[PDB]
Amino acid sequence: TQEQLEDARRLKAGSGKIEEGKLVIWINGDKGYNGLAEVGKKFEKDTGIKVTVEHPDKLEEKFPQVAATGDGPDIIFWAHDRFGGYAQSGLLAEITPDKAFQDKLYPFTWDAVRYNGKLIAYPIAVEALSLIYNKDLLPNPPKTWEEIPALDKELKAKGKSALMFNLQEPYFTWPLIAADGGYAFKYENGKYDIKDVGVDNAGAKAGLTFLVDLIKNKHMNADTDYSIAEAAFNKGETAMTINGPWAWSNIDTSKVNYGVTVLPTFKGQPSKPFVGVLSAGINAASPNKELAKEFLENYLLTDEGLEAVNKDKPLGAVALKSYEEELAKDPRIAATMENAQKGEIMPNIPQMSAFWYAVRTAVINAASGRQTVDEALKDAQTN
Numbered sequence: 247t248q249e250q251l252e253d254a255r256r257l258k259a260g261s262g263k264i265e266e267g268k269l270v271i272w273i274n275g276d277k278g279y280n281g282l283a284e285v286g287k288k289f290e291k292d293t294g295i296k297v298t299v300e301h302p303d304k305l306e307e308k309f310p311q312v313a314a315t316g317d318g319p320d321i322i323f324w325a326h327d328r329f330g331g332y333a334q335s336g337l338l339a340e341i342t343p344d345k346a347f348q349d350k351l352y353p354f355t356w357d358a359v360r361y362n363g364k365l366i367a368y369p370i371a372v373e374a375l376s377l378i379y380n381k382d383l384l385p386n387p388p389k390t391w392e393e394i395p396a397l398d399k400e401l402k403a404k405g406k407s408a409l410m411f412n413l414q415e416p417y418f419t420w421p422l423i424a425a426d427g428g429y430a431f432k433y434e435n436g437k438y439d440i441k442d443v444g445v446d447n448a449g450a451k452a453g454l455t456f457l458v459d460l461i462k463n464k465h466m467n468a469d470t471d472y473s474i475a476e477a478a479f480n481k482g483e484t485a486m487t488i489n490g491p492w493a494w495s496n497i498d499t500s501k502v503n504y505g506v507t508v509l510p511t512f513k514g515q516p517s518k519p520f521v522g523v524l525s526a527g528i529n530a531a532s533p534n535k536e537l538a539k540e541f542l543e544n545y546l547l548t549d550e551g552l553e554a555v556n557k558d559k560p561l562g563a564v565a566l567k568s569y570e571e572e573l574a575k576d577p578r579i580a581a582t583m584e585n586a587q588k589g590e591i592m593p594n595i596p597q598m599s600a601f602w603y604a605v606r607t608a609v610i611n612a613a614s615g616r617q618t619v620d621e622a623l624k625d626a627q628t629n
């Protein structure tokens with residue numbers, strides 16, 4: 247091995263290398279990490295406790311690797327779906343808010359961070375993809391996926407395109423795949439059936455086939471990723487994109503007169519985005535669990551704390567009732583919640599990591615022509 251060898255060092259160098267008396271926080275690079283750092287500076291100014299916010303690449307993969315050895319950040323930020331796996335591996339602490347604090351957040355946000363009956367993270371905000379469109383190029387967005395080919399033909403004649411979004415992450419293609427019947431794991435009798443995966447059915451096939459056909463007919467490019475799509479939309483080159491609340495800040499900066507709205511239907515069915523709750527978990531190896539709790543409950547999850555993050559990159563519909571009442575006025579938030587209602591909240595089971603990896607490969611291989619749609623989804627279904 248070169249993992250059982252550090253089983254020997256971790257005791258000799260006993261025990262744990264997370265620095266006591268400060269907080270290290272990891273959050274994804276597309277989120278308001280500068281705004282979160284402002285909340286951390288307020289904490290430091292009040293309490294003397296230094297807070298360092300980091301946004302490493304692939305943190306959702308690095309965290310279980312480093313936390314398994316007792317290293318990593320004190321606090322990890324990510325959508326709730328990854329947290330059941332972390333908790334199953336013993337990497338997350340059970341969190342302990344009194345009832346007065348729990349009443350400050352929406353009951354459904356607490357449910358996303360409950361694993362085997364216990365709370366394993368603090369919920370921050372509800373994320374759902376919406377259709378984002380350029381009102382100057384497209385005063386009225388398409389109601390259906392099916393009319394997008396004809397729209398692209400029209401826009402292509404003008405050196406524009408209809409739609410670009412990140413084809414590299416299955417998160418972004420899922421709303422179309424799920425629209426006519428795709429699902430991850432079938433939930434029944436109080437639990438997810440890990441042997442009942444729904445990525446190989448007729449509905450999932452129809453959705454992915456529609457996407458592949460878009461690419462075959464030159465209405466999309468298989469290599470489009472997050473940065474390519476964001477640049478194209480914000481430069482005014484494409485009429486539509488698909489993204490979450492965090493993206494609105496850069497569009498504000500851009501020249502673009504944009505709207506946020508319901509995703510198009512497919513075969514008459516609503517697109518069904520998987521809904522994420524951005525959540526903050528506490529590293530089980532952290533010597534700073536009480537510090538982490540004080541920071542999360544009394545500094546971040548306040549009107550002032552969430553505002554600071556939100557002003558950097560919008561959080562979506564926040565879990566904190568008092569602040570959401572102010573944000574609910576925003577039509578972009580209304581659209582987010584409309585898409586969220588039509589979708590469904592992600593599972594947090596340990597199998598989600600394998601699921602996302604399977605679907606990622608399936609979409610990329612089908613989109614690039616390395617596999618047929620049937621072949622790709624059959625593979626993703628198995629196991």
Ligand SMILES: OC[C@H]1O[C@H](O[C@H]2[C@H](O)[C@@H](O)[C@@H](O)O[C@@H]2CO)[C@H](O)[C@@H](O)[C@@H]1O
Pocket residue numbers: 274276306324325326327328373415416417418522602
């Ligand atoms: O694409 C698979 C990916 O989907 C979700 O990741 C989202 C995340 O929830 C959003 O907050 C935002 O950062 O975009 C990500 C997609 O690039 C799942 O949460 C994640 O576990 C999964 O791998």
